[PDB]
Motif scaffolding. Structure first.
Motif, PDB file in Angstrom:
ATOM      1  N   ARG A 187       0.758  -1.272   0.022  1.00 49.32           N
ATOM      2  CA  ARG A 187       0.076  -0.142  -0.129  1.00 49.32           C
ATOM      3  C   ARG A 187       1.049   1.244   0.217  1.00 49.32           C
ATOM      4  O   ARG A 187       0.580   2.163  -0.845  1.00 49.32           O
ATOM      5  CB  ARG A 187      -0.893  -0.006   1.079  1.00 49.32           C
ATOM      6  N   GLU A 188       1.900   1.218   0.987  1.00 50.58           N
ATOM      7  CA  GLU A 188       2.721   2.480   1.040  1.00 50.58           C
ATOM      8  C   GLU A 188       3.464   2.833  -0.435  1.00 50.58           C
ATOM      9  O   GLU A 188       3.409   3.901  -0.880  1.00 50.58           O
ATOM     10  CB  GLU A 188       3.682   2.469   1.987  1.00 50.58           C
ATOM     11  N   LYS A 189       3.919   1.571  -0.965  1.00 47.81           N
ATOM     12  CA  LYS A 189       4.377   1.843  -2.193  1.00 47.81           C
ATOM     13  C   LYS A 189       3.736   1.960  -3.526  1.00 47.81           C
ATOM     14  O   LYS A 189       4.163   2.446  -4.383  1.00 47.81           O
ATOM     15  CB  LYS A 189       5.379   0.601  -2.630  1.00 47.81           C
ATOM     16  N   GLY A 190       2.547   2.469  -3.214  1.00 47.69           N
ATOM     17  CA  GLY A 190       1.505   2.835  -4.343  1.00 47.69           C
ATOM     18  C   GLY A 190       1.230   1.519  -5.280  1.00 47.69           C
ATOM     19  O   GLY A 190       0.522   1.925  -6.185  1.00 47.69           O
ATOM     20  N   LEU A 191       1.320   0.204  -4.824  1.00 45.87           N
ATOM     21  CA  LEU A 191       1.270  -0.685  -5.637  1.00 45.87           C
ATOM     22  C   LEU A 191      -0.193  -1.287  -5.730  1.00 45.87           C
ATOM     23  O   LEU A 191      -0.577  -1.490  -6.817  1.00 45.87           O
ATOM     24  CB  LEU A 191       2.202  -1.987  -5.491  1.00 45.87           C
ATOM     25  N   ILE A 192      -0.801  -1.195  -4.740  1.00 47.30           N
ATOM     26  CA  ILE A 192      -2.106  -1.353  -4.513  1.00 47.30           C
ATOM     27  C   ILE A 192      -2.921  -0.406  -3.765  1.00 47.30           C
ATOM     28  O   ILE A 192      -2.385   0.100  -2.849  1.00 47.30           O
ATOM     29  CB  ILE A 192      -2.483  -2.713  -3.634  1.00 47.30           C
ATOM     30  N   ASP A 193      -4.042   0.040  -4.283  1.00 48.81           N
ATOM     31  CA  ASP A 193      -4.701   1.227  -3.699  1.00 48.81           C
ATOM     32  C   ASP A 193      -6.033   0.768  -3.517  1.00 48.81           C
ATOM     33  O   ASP A 193      -6.275  -0.709  -3.089  1.00 48.81           O
ATOM     34  CB  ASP A 193      -5.255   2.294  -4.851  1.00 48.81           C
ATOM     35  N   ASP A 194      -6.823   1.442  -2.521  1.00 50.68           N
ATOM     36  CA  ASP A 194      -8.276   0.797  -1.984  1.00 50.68           C
ATOM     37  C   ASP A 194      -9.177   0.440  -3.234  1.00 50.68           C
ATOM     38  O   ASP A 194     -10.177  -0.081  -2.606  1.00 50.68           O
ATOM     39  CB  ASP A 194      -8.691   2.163  -1.185  1.00 50.68           C
ATOM     40  N   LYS A 195      -9.101   1.087  -4.387  1.00 50.54           N
ATOM     41  CA  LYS A 195     -10.008   0.695  -5.254  1.00 50.54           C
ATOM     42  C   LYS A 195      -9.346  -0.181  -6.390  1.00 50.54           C
ATOM     43  O   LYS A 195      -9.373  -0.109  -7.560  1.00 50.54           O
ATOM     44  CB  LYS A 195     -10.291   2.105  -5.966  1.00 50.54           C
ATOM     45  N   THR A 196      -8.820  -1.385  -5.607  1.00 50.68           N
ATOM     46  CA  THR A 196      -8.390  -2.565  -6.537  1.00 50.68           C
ATOM     47  C   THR A 196      -9.392  -3.688  -5.980  1.00 50.68           C
ATOM     48  O   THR A 196      -9.717  -3.635  -5.028  1.00 50.68           O
ATOM     49  CB  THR A 196      -6.988  -2.844  -6.060  1.00 50.68           C
ATOM     50  N   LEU A 197      -9.543  -4.747  -6.941  1.00 53.75           N
ATOM     51  CA  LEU A 197     -10.328  -5.969  -6.580  1.00 53.75           C
ATOM     52  C   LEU A 197      -9.268  -7.004  -6.198  1.00 53.75           C
ATOM     53  O   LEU A 197      -8.309  -7.556  -6.832  1.00 53.75           O
ATOM     54  CB  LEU A 197     -10.917  -6.388  -8.082  1.00 53.75           C
ATOM     55  N   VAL A 198      -9.618  -7.423  -5.102  1.00 50.47           N
ATOM     56  CA  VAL A 198      -8.907  -8.493  -4.516  1.00 50.47           C
ATOM     57  C   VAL A 198      -9.717  -9.912  -4.461  1.00 50.47           C
ATOM     58  O   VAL A 198     -10.643 -10.018  -3.966  1.00 50.47           O
ATOM     59  CB  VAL A 198      -8.417  -8.414  -3.060  1.00 50.47           C
ATOM     60  N   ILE A 199      -9.213 -10.562  -5.643  1.00 47.95           N
ATOM     61  CA  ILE A 199      -9.962 -12.051  -5.811  1.00 47.95           C
ATOM     62  C   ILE A 199      -9.341 -13.019  -4.959  1.00 47.95           C
ATOM     63  O   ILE A 199      -8.130 -13.228  -5.158  1.00 47.95           O
ATOM     64  CB  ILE A 199      -9.872 -12.261  -7.381  1.00 47.95           C
ATOM     65  N   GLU A 200     -10.063 -13.533  -4.170  1.00 52.15           N
ATOM     66  CA  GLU A 200      -9.561 -14.604  -3.117  1.00 52.15           C
ATOM     67  C   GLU A 200      -9.627 -15.845  -3.616  1.00 52.15           C
ATOM     68  O   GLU A 200     -10.985 -16.481  -3.663  1.00 52.15           O
ATOM     69  CB  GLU A 200     -10.154 -14.424  -1.901  1.00 52.15           C
ATOM     70  N   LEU A 201      -8.756 -16.705  -4.054  1.00 47.44           N
ATOM     71  CA  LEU A 201      -8.712 -18.021  -4.610  1.00 47.44           C
ATOM     72  C   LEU A 201      -8.389 -18.954  -3.545  1.00 47.44           C
ATOM     73  O   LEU A 201      -7.148 -18.732  -2.911  1.00 47.44           O
ATOM     74  CB  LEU A 201      -7.642 -17.941  -5.673  1.00 47.44           C
ATOM     75  N   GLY A 202      -9.236 -19.745  -3.540  1.00 49.11           N
ATOM     76  CA  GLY A 202      -8.875 -20.697  -2.337  1.00 49.11           C
ATOM     77  C   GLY A 202     -10.378 -21.333  -1.861  1.00 49.11           C
ATOM     78  O   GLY A 202     -11.371 -21.021  -2.261  1.00 49.11           O
ATOM     79  N   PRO A 203     -10.197 -22.606  -1.038  1.00 49.98           N
ATOM     80  CA  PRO A 203     -11.271 -23.118  -0.519  1.00 49.98           C
ATOM     81  C   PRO A 203     -12.312 -22.407   0.351  1.00 49.98           C
ATOM     82  O   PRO A 203     -13.477 -22.794   0.537  1.00 49.98           O
ATOM     83  CB  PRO A 203     -10.846 -24.347   0.156  1.00 49.98           C
ATOM     84  N   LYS A 204     -11.985 -21.350   1.028  1.00 53.78           N
ATOM     85  CA  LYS A 204     -12.674 -20.742   2.023  1.00 53.78           C
ATOM     86  C   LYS A 204     -11.991 -19.157   2.163  1.00 53.78           C
ATOM     87  O   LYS A 204     -10.487 -18.991   2.386  1.00 53.78           O
ATOM     88  CB  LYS A 204     -12.459 -21.293   3.149  1.00 53.78           C
ATOM     89  N   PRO A 205     -12.798 -18.075   2.143  1.00 58.97           N
ATOM     90  CA  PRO A 205     -12.094 -16.775   2.246  1.00 58.97           C
ATOM     91  C   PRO A 205     -11.626 -16.485   3.761  1.00 58.97           C
ATOM     92  O   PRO A 205     -12.277 -16.161   4.657  1.00 58.97           O
ATOM     93  CB  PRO A 205     -13.032 -15.779   2.169  1.00 58.97           C
ATOM     94  N   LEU A 206     -10.019 -16.345   3.783  1.00 54.14           N
ATOM     95  CA  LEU A 206      -9.510 -16.109   5.105  1.00 54.14           C
ATOM     96  C   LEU A 206      -8.679 -14.844   5.067  1.00 54.14           C
ATOM     97  O   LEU A 206      -8.769 -14.114   5.819  1.00 54.14           O
ATOM     98  CB  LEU A 206      -8.676 -17.374   5.626  1.00 54.14           C
ATOM     99  N   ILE A 207      -8.140 -14.619   3.870  1.00 55.70           N
ATOM    100  CA  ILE A 207      -7.244 -13.513   3.717  1.00 55.70           C
ATOM    101  C   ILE A 207      -8.196 -12.285   3.477  1.00 55.70           C
ATOM    102  O   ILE A 207      -7.787 -11.100   3.392  1.00 55.70           O
ATOM    103  CB  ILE A 207      -6.246 -13.566   2.334  1.00 55.70           C
TER     104      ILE A 207
END
Lengths: 1252, 109
Positions: free
Chosen positions: A1159-1179
């Motif tokens: 976040r600090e490095k500007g690589l991911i902002d708040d308007k980014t889509l976090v697609i959670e791949l896995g059997p269960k959303p924990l992240i």
């Protein structure tokens, strides 16, 4: 052993139906080649041996025209021999080219021919395969044509007064002994003094009959006399001499075999034994040429002895099969007749017959020999800004002839005496389009300043072309036939008004360039990025139909896979009125008013028209909405007329007959004729007699209960002079759509038909006066379209009915569906939303799955976007209404949000994991099974039972299986998202999801991930001990826990958030810490695990695991990787190594710090889509607690839930962000919904770019 | 090919080579020893595709295959590379399921 008998018949057979069958076969290359080459050779030969007058009547360009002219009595008896031999050889070729049988062989076959049927027998006997038989058969057809010419010459040499007496040269007389007939002939000839050349002779000697041949006059006089009244007689309709050694000689055969040398006489030896129809014995084996000479000798010099044949054929087999196993059945293969005799003579032993067509299907007929499907259409017509308004106007039979308004030009300003000056008009009528200035330049990337300088026809052609493209669901570069370099444009335009000449108010450099005349198709090519051929046609009054002919020719040649054929006609400059209104060609009255006793001229009209054409195969493969099928296009010129203007009945008859011959259809298969109906008093008369001569030639003609209707769109909209062809085609396609023949408005109720058409009804040719039902049935409806020009050119187009394919109805497993809308501006977004809402209110029973398919997969997606999800059409309608109310797409989008792939750890396993995607998408299932096999080949147990079976949770499961199941499920999910077109910009995995992140980043291959995970798990199982350590989730900052960890020998396992930490250690130390901090109020969750990664329990396997990791290939990352271990980013090659992978499994997972640094490095902002791949959303919780509530996290799977709400939210969010989805792969596994629904047209952002 | 070496989209290097004067059993033993010593994953091991009478063909990933040949105890043998760059003739990598996937769009009644 068994044998086969091939029999070939004589000229008495009925060959026209069978020959017509051969000309329609489709998947036989050798048969098509045979027909083509036989016609070529006969065409060459018939110029040498025919006189000038007789050749002109019989001249043909193709075999279908030859077969037509034969039945019309335009050929000679010499052609009958050639055509019968050709039919026999073609029938043999088809029989053996369709069944795939082994070609007949010398040791198991015999060949026999009767009375000139022996030529085909010789040709067939001198071949070993169908490839060797083709040239031999073409040569044999030539020789058979030459045999007929020799007999015609002898007929004329004996009876020169019998050029008209083609009366039966033969008759059959029953119950007459040959000797008694001979004596009676002798006595009659002696008594009547008949010249020796006119005597009767016996051609054939059967058992119950004989055939008597001779000149018709003497033959009939001999039969019509006493001593023969008792016998019953039947004429044979053959009118040539034959089987007379007193008239023909060996020197006649030598002239037949003149243009037939082959360097070795045995160039073709004989293979199959040959039986003579004049001896009944087997002919001594010879070569081709020596056997054709024998055949011609038997035909012209000898008596055909059928009784000897019947006696000798049974004996021929008896002497042969007796030496063989035994006498066994006989397959009899026939071409014209004489079978039925053989089973009766054979029932003493052996007989059978044949049939079959049993080879596998092929790829459809190629670019040629194939039909063309019209997949969409559009246009603009007077008072009809759509094709729907055009039909509504056709249905009630309205005429819209009207005078010029002040908008175009005021006549009152032209008030002046006789117009001898420049730009003086003489007529006031004309059907202009009021809606000519409307355009949407921004959609086409055109400046609004450039729009007024464009030709209005060009702009309307652009919009109509897009509308036609929309109606077919055509998206460039999505199917083989829609690659941008395979799409051509074929425009037909004759008069360009205010396109290149008139403009004077403003002039710029880009004035003549871009609009000369070739820039209509050129601008369509550039604007739509069509990189195929491009043409314009000027054929003045048949420009559009001739352009459609050119497009069809390009499609039949292969120059393109999709064609855009259209035409325009604009009268923006009324100067054209003056020129035509001089010879009375134009009209001083209303509309065209076609054929009647009231015609005085035609009224000019404007219009636009577009159709999209493919080959039928490509439209069937693309699931396109076929409107109709083109069967043939034909063009010729009425050059042999008194003047170019004057129409010629013969030329039009020839054109329509050519089209009919090409299609192979009878005139009774046509239920409608769309006539040119020029509107002239004499002009329509010529076309009506042409139509009747071709289609309803007489009363009691083949029209019995099948009426023929005639009409023209020129009665409703006027004469388009360049859009007439497209206008007529569009009208005809909309008749098949609505199953109605529209009323004809040319004749008033109180008027009468023209006296030159006195008994149209008696011929079964009607003109509708009220809408007529025209139902769609199992028999297609065929239409003929006619277009003529004063330049003399005639075009004819035959249009069929589209087939019914299968439309595989079946329920869609999806519970909800996505409906997508898009536009290039906000106004168009609102317009399209309103239009779809109104459409769904008006058609509440529409299919929702097909609606989704049409809106997503079959559309191009523009900047502004909207999405809606509903379980039924009513829910979708409500949601569309809310979207209309709230805005939702009217504001410009922005920023194209970044996509982050997050992979969950190893605490998310549960039975029946990802089984819903496994059952929904075959690609996901294939990937998962591939990974299971890959793991098995690495030496690990299969894990697929975890994701499918519901039995067993942890009791029978080792760490390796569950870890590999999670990892391979995540890799398969990554592949599935990649197929849909979702490309991550950065990846991060927690503890066991790090490997999936590396796979997604391109660092590791599938085998390296499986290898590393499985080896790590196996080492863990082998070395460590189960149940020694434990984990503790604590709601406290890691700093605040320093004292409790530095005294109880614990460690920080994971730092999942600002105030969430996981501690690991021995069970005793964990319990002590829990007790100590429990009394301090801290809230803790105790987790019992068999193996605790990121703890001291995995120390022993560190060195071993680092050695194994040396065998894996670590490649350069393809995308950013967030490293909880280094707490920073990885974007170089050497950072991830076997040393990195060793530390990762032992040190702490600082998920919070990695996200914070990103976040600090500007690589991911708040308007980014976090697609959670896995059997269960924990992240997802980790991201929410670490970054905030403003970041959107999208889970994929969940224990007890449906995938579709979750899967469709990912696609909807990515699609609305601005990214492109592979919608064709989201709909791919559901064939029921893959049908194009007819939705409203594009919501053009129209503005009036009218130039004063 | 891509499932084993995803970093071999560019490495379309010869997945096979011809080695002359090498017995199949000696080649098998040398492959086993080399793979055990160098710690090569089971999926990257060399395998003998062809066994002629004078030569054998060795197939594998280009990186491991070249390292196996470019070592002592194989310098004597004359080797040439086959310019094919696909796996085949490996029952430890392929299965009946791959063939079943191949024969998917091919039913005849």
């Amino acid at each position: 052993q068994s044998r086969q008998l091939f029999l070939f018949g004589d000229q008495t057979a009925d060959f026209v139906p069978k020959l017509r069958s051969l000309l329609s076969v489709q998947d036989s290359p050798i048969l098509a080649a045979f027909l083509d080459q036989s016609h070529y050779v006969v065409r060459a030969q018939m110029l040498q041996s025919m006189n000038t007058v007789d050749h002109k009547l019989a001249r043909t360009a193709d075999l279908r025209q030859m077969v037509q002219k034969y039945v019309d009595g335009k050929l000679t008896p010499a052609f009958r021999t050639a055509l019968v031999c050709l039919c026999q050889l073609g029938c043999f070729i088809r029989e053996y080219e369709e069944s795939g049988n082994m070609y007949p062989q010398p040791s198991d076959s015999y060949v026999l021919g009767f009375c000139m049927g022996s030529l085909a027998a010789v040709a067939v006997s001198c071949s070993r395969s169908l490839s060797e038989l083709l040239p031999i058969a073409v040569q044999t057809v030539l020789i058979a044509f030459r045999l007929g010419l020799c007999a015609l010459e002898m007929r004329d040499r004996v009876d020169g007064c019998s050029d008209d007496r083609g009366d039966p040269w033969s008759t059959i007389v029953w119950g007459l002994d040959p000797q008694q007939a001979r004596d009676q002939i002798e006595v009659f000839c002696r008594t009547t003094n008949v010249p020796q050349t006119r005597r009767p002779w016996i051609s054939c000697i059967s058992k119950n009959a004989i055939t008597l041949s001779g000149s018709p006059s003497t033959l009939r006089a001999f039969c019509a006399m006493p001593q023969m009244a008792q016998h019953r007689t039947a004429p044979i309709p053959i009118c040539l001499p034959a089987h007379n050694g007193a008239l023909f000689t060996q020197a006649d055969i030598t002239t037949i075999l003149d243009t037939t040398p082959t360097t070795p006489w045995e160039q073709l030896p004989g293979q199959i034994p040959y039986i003579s129809h004049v001896t009944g014995n087997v002919v001594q084996t010879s070569n081709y040429r020596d056997l054709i000479e024998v055949a011609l000798s038997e035909t012209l010099l000898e008596q055909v002895r059928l009784d000897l044949v019947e006696t000798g054929l049974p004996r021929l087999l008896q002497s042969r099969q007796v030496k063989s196993v035994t006498i066994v059945p006989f397959l009899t293969r026939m071409n014209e007749t004489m079978s039925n005799i053989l089973p009766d003579s054979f029932i003493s032993t052996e007989t059978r017959t044949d049939t079959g067509r049993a080879i596998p299907a092929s790829g459809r007929p190629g670019a040629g020999k194939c039909k063309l499907a019209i997949v969409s259409m559009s246009g603009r017509f007077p008072e009809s800004p759509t094709t729907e308004s055009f039909w509504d106007l056709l249905y009630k039979g309205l005429d819209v002839c009207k005078e010029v308004p002040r908008r175009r030009w005021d006549i009152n300003t032209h008030v002046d005496p006789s117009g001898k000056a420049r730009n003086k008009g003489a007529t006031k009528w004309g059907c202009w389009l009021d809606f000519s200035g409307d355009f949407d330049p921004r959609f086409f990337g055109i400046s609004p300043k450039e729009a007024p300088q464009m030709d209005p026809a060009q702009r309307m052609a652009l919009m109509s072309t897009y509308e036609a493209m929309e109606r077919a669901g055509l998206v460039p570069d999505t199917t083989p036939s829609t690659q941008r370099d395979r799409i051509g444009v074929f425009h037909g335009v004759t008069s360009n008004d205010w396109m290149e000449t008139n403009t004077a108010q403003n002039i710029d450099t880009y004035f003549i360039t871009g609009g000369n005349r070739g820039f209509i198709p050129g601008r369509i090519n550039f604007c739509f990025e069509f990189a195929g051929p491009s043409y314009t046609n000027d054929t003045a009054c048949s420009s559009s139909l001739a352009a459609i002919h050119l497009a069809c020719n390009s499609l039949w040649r292969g120059d393109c896979d999709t064609a855009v054929a259209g035409g325009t006609n604009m009268i923006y400059t009324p100067d054209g009125h003056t020129g035509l209104d001089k010879g009375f060609f134009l009209s001083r009255t209303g509309n065209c008013k076609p054929y009647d006793d009231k015609a005085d001229g035609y009224c000019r009209a404007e219009g636009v028209g577009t159709v999209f054409i493919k080959r039928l195969e490509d439209a069937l493969a693309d699931n396109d909405p076929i409107l109709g099928v083109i069967l043939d296009a034909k063009t010729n010129h009425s050059a042999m007329s008194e003047s170019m203007t004057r129409p010629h009945v013969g030329a039009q008859i020839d054109n329509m007959t050519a089209a009919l011959n090409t299609t192979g259809l009878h005139p009774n298969d046509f239920s409608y004729i769309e006539m040119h109906g020029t509107g002239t008093q004499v002009g329509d008369a010529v076309e009506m007699e042409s139509v009747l001569s071709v289609f309803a030639p007489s009363e009691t003609a083949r029209k019995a209960d099948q009426p023929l209707f005639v009409g023209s769109a020129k009665a409703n909209v006027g004469h388009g002079e360049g859009v007439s062809g497209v206008t007529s085609l569009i009208k005809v396609l909309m008749m098949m759509q609505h199953d109605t023949i529209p009323p004809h408005c040319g004749i008033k109720p109180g008027s009468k038909i023209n006296r030159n058409f006195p008994d149209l009804g008696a011929r079964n040719v009607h003109i509708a006066f009220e809408p007529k039902p025209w139902p769609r049935t199992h028999t297609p409806r065929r239409v003929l379209i006619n277009n003529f020009s004063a330049a003399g050119g005639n075009t004819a187009l035959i249009v069929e009915d589209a087939p019914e394919r299968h439309w595989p109805t079946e329920k869609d497993p999806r519970s909800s569906h996505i409906v997508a809308l898009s536009a290039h501006v906000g106004a168009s977004m609102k317009t399209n939303l309103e239009r779809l809402h109104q459409y769904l209110l008006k058609n509440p029973h529409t299919d929702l799955a097909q609606l989704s398919y049409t809106t997503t997969a079959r559309r191009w997606h523009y900047l502004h976007r909207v999405s809606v999800t509903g379980a039924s059409v009513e829910e979708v309608t409500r949601k569309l209404e809310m979207a209309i109310q709230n805005g939702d797409g009217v504001s410009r989008p922005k920023s194209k949000p970044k996509i982050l792939f997050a992979f969950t750890g190893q605490g998310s396993q549960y039975a029946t994991m990802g089984k819903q995607v496994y059952d929904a998408y075959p690609s996901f299932r294939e990937d998962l099974e591939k990974f299971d096999r890959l793991a098995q080949s690495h030496g690990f147990p299969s894990f697929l039972h975890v994701c499918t079976s519901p039995k067993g949770d942890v009791e029978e499961m080792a760490p390796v299986v569950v870890q590999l199941a999670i990892t391979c499920l995540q890799m398969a999910l990554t592949n599935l998202m990649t197929s849909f077109g979702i490309r991550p910009d950065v990846t991060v995995g927690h503890s066991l999801g790090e490997f999936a992140a590396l796979y997604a980043a391109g660092v590791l291959s599938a085998s390296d991930v499986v290898y590393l995970v499985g080896q790590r798990a196996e080492l863990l199982q082998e070395r460590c001990q189960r149940g020694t350590h434990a984990m503790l989730a604590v709601k406290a900052t890691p700093e605040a826990l320093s004292q409790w960890i530095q005294d109880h020998d614990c460690e920080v396992a994971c730092i999942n958030g600002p105030e969430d930490t996981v501690l690991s250690g021995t069970t005793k130390n964990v319990a002590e810490v829990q007790r100590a901090m429990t009394d301090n109020g801290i809230k803790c969750t105790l987790l019992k695990l068999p193996f605790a990664f990121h703890s001291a329990q995995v120390q022993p396997i560190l060195d071993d695991f680092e050695a194994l990791a040396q065998g894996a290939t670590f490649a350069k990352p393809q995308l950013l990787i967030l490293s909880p271990l280094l707490r920073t980013e990885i974007h170089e090659q050497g950072v991830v190594t076997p040393s990195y992978v060793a530390q990762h499994c032992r040190h702490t997972v600082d998920m919070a710090q990695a996200l914070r640094s990103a976040r600090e490095k500007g690589l991911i902002d708040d308007k980014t889509l976090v697609i959670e791949l896995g059997p269960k959303p924990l992240i997802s919780g980790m991201v929410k607690m670490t970054l905030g509530d403003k970041i959107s996290t999208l889970p994929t799977l969940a224990p007890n839930k449906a995938i579709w709400p979750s899967l469709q939210k990912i696609l909807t969010s990515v699609y609305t962000g601005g990214w492109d989805i592979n919608w064709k792969k989201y709909h791919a596994p559901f064939a029921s919904s893959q049908k194009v629904v007819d939705l409203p047209s594009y919501g053009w952002d129209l503005k009036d770019y009218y130039i004063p």
